[PDB]
Amino acid sequence: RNRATRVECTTIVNGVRRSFYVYANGGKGFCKLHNWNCVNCDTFCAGSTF
Binding site for other proteins (CB under 8 A): 32-33, 42
Q: How many CB atoms lie within 10 A of CB 12?
A: 8
43 annotated ligand-binding residue? no
Nearest to 48 by CA among 19, 23, 29: 23
45 annotated ligand-binding residue? no
What is the C-alpha to C-alpha distance for residues 26 and 5, in angstroms, rounded to an integer? Answer: 5
Q: Give the shortest CB-29-to-other proteins separation in angstroms.
A: 13
9 annotated ligand-binding residue? no
- List residues forming the annotated binding site: 31, 34, 38, 41
- List residues forming the annotated binding site for Zn(2+): 31, 34, 38, 41
